[PDB]
Amino acid sequence: MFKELIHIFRTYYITFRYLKKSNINFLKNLSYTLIAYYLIINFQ
Amino acid sequence: LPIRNIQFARYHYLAAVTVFTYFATRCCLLDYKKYYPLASVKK
Amino acid sequence: MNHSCQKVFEGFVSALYDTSYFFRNFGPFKATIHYATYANYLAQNWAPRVSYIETSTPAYTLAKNKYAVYIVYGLIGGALIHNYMLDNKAAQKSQQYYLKHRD
């Protein structure tokens, strides 16, 4: 899902090509942390 | 090759996605202030 | 661009690059970034999990690796049910306490 979204953005947007796989992985980690925080907090 | 508790992992992923979408979109918890004009009244 | 603006832009970009390099490669800052990177790797790629690839024979797989999911489910369900029962008990206790205190 996240991989597919990143792939579509990379293949369609020329400017997105600047980001490295390392930067993509950092965004992935931040997104996973934020999703976990959202799931936990919504029940609090 | 064997994956332990693969069915459990699938169900956990599905439940996580369902809960995240539920909370993000509030699809089940709609708003009816728009429907109020188009509703009858009692008392 | 105009050559004067080119001089200004070159100076600005060189300053930005030098600042970034100094902040990243400074001793204490470098150590902090290194340890934080390894910690983030551990947190993301080695979080607690219930499903994993089993590359060991049933004779070489522990019973914990076979009943961990059941143990976790039991723990979580028992915690939730016990919390619900404690909520009911607290409700009853408060009701009785205040009723006997007055009205």
Added chain:
Amino acid sequence: MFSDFNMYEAKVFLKAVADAQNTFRQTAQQENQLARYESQSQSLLNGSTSGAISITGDNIQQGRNFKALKEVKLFQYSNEIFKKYLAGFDSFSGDYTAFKKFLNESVKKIEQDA
């Protein structure tokens, strides 16, 4: 238990009853608050005129005629009644029911002696 229509009827009726009780409270409180303001203003004026107290800036100072102040008389009589009738009230480490019984007995004694 009951239909939602009946539940909402009950909710509305309870809201009305609560509002009526609030109306009673507001009426009584407003009347007694006007009376209290009038009484306090008159007491302050009487004290200032008689010289019992001197009111300057944001402070009240004891005057030469302090002993004749109506507030002083009220305080003395309050102490006298708390001694004669409502004795032991200040330090009564009893149960709530015992405290209520003590208050009732004190009220009865005051009524008898009045």
Added chain:
Amino acid sequence: SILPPLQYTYSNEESLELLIHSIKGNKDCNSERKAFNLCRSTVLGKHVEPEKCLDKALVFVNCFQKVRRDESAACQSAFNSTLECGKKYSESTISLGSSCQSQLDAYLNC
């Protein structure tokens, strides 16, 4: 906690009795309640000079007290049946079933 705290502690029996009496009153003396709400809606009648609503509030309270004080024997019997059914429903911790709508309707039609 976000839920409001309770002011007066009502026993289960008292709560059920007051609820049933409130439902009965909302039918018996709705006119007085409506007049009281109308008089208390205004700023002058709500905050500044609430005393003007005192008579209407007294009338509404008298009507509610009359409703609470079941005078007719049939009314007392219907209220007792409804209250017993409500007590059973409340005390039924097991999966709940039939409702008390029939008994409520009989008490309201009494």
Added chain:
Amino acid sequence: IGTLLYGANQSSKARENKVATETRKERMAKPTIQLTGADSQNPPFTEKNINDWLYKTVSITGRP
């Protein structure tokens, strides 16, 4: 480090003690309260509201 922390704690205790002394002196500066008769037989002092009477001059009659 331990003795420096102890010295800081001692200075804080000194400040707190002087504040307590000032407030207690202010409380004692008030006129004495004479408890006689019923009040003397039933002193107002109680653990529930002792802070109201702490460091307050009271003239009380009793049997030592």
Added chain:
Amino acid sequence: ARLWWTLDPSKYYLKQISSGGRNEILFTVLGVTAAYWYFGNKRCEHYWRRQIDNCQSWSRAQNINGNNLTVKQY
């Protein structure tokens, strides 16, 4: 187009630790303890409450400067 949707876990995160399965029971115990503490505090705060409305519940208001709050009838 290519079909890609699937609920199956990714093999990148399915690795085990050297000593056996991943640290699941320990983290579950920690989470249970944290949830117990949190819900106990919430229940204690929620259930043991009452609202007392009387004269002693009101105190004189003051500004952020500490002075008593009074507004003129301008």
Added chain:
Amino acid sequence: SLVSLFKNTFLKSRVIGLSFQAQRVMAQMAKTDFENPDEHFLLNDAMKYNELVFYGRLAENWSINPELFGKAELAKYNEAKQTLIDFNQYHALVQNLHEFYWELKTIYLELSRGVATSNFHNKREVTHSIIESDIKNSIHKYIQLIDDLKDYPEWQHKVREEIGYYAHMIYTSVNHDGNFPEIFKEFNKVDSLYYF
């Protein structure tokens, strides 16, 4: 010294375990390209790559207590430490090459956005002096790197195949007029012929 014993045991275990994998990790890094040398570890499988990266610094810096070490054990620990230092140097070299590759790719992306069909707002017919000079200096540095990598035929071949691809794309992206001969003088010697 219980604390010293625990520290030495941890250091030995981690260092030896990762020294046994440094060969595979470096082989995978060499196999992968310069755009994302850690692409395999990030996407497919992290074969102790992050562990090596983390524990290289510890091997370099943290002290040792020989009295807690044996003879063969100490020799093995020294060998593992040297292997980890070599891995650190290899990673630094790979990072430098990757950053140079991304510099060239940034130039290529700047050119591509200029010729993009969607670029209805920043369409420029003639290449400008700033980017021309950037291309010239980047090509000069690439030629210098190729010369410096003469003693490592495999490294030179990989550097060509990876980095010079974008240089060839830049060459193709512009017409052969203006300052083009001077800009691509060094490239035309060998590199242009290779990318044909």
Added chain:
Amino acid sequence: VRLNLKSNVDQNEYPFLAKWDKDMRQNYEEYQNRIDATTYHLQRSQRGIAVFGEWMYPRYFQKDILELEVLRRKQQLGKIYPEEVSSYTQINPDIANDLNLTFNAKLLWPVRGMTVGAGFFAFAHLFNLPYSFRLGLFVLPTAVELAFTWGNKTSQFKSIEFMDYLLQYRVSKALLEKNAKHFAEKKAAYQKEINSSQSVQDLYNQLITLVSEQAPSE
């Protein structure tokens, strides 16, 4: 209740009270429609089933309850004038900044965001950046300012506090106007006898404390 819009208060004798009543009656219809809509939404969401409803009715429909409370208090107040906001500035310096975000009083432009965007535009012009890039860098700070501006239910909470304060102040003012004539005569002797402007309640409390401390019990 469909209250009439013609206030029954005498403007000649109770001007502020008449004005307050007129404003309240004028806005009552609209605020009552909004309150009815909110209440209907709440009750239908409660009537919903399982996760679509009752199971999580009281705890997750918090914004609706907050809006209902704000609407009720604003209906009771009728209208808000800048004088009262300045008065409450004593305890809440940002009272206006919170009331503007709580109520639809005036259209709010992200002035700070637009200024930052203009600065980025100047930077882009100086360094010869594309117009698309500078337009994006103008939009981004505007979006950040709008995101940080809208929402902010803490502003709604502070608006509720301010509205409670204002309602109490208006009730006290109405009582003052009602009893001004009655207290006129007493007011002159109080002005001629007491040179302090402090409140009668505060002075009487201080006098009670002074009596309790200094007066002999006897």
Added chain:
Amino acid sequence: FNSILFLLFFIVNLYWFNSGLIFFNSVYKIHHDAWTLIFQTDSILNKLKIYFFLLPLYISSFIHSISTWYYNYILNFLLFSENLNTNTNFVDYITYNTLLLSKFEDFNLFVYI
């Protein structure tokens, strides 16, 4: 002779002076007139402790006293007017003003900046 070392020492001195100012302000609020009883105590140990822990305050007060003395001398020279309030000798004046710390009673470095 290093700029980095100079800046670090200056920052440390600023933090120490701010902490001393806060401590002195609190102690003065508590000892409006009795602060000297503890600040200038005859005990050598207490005197040394106070001087060491308020060195930034004492050096700042010394600099302020020197500056005020020189400024007053300049004013007297230019205007042929009076003395430095009184005819206090240089040693007495400087010692008195350096020992006096009440000048920092309402002063906080962070607030001033």
Added chain:
Amino acid sequence: MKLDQIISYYITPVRRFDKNLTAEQIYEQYQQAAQFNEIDAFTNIRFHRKFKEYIQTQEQSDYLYEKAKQISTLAQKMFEKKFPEYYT
């Protein structure tokens, strides 16, 4: 949350009164509770501080305050009888 539980939050703010009391009697009780007397200034001081030790519910608060008001009213009447001069 069901209506059976929600209605509790609307039943709680209603004070409990005997069903045989008229509205006039309830209003008289409220008037007696809110009554004002000069001597209240000190009797209130001596009463509320004590009542803080026992008040945990609104019913207890109501009962204690009503008894305090009744005592204060009796004391006010006795004081008026004793000191007719201040009230002429």
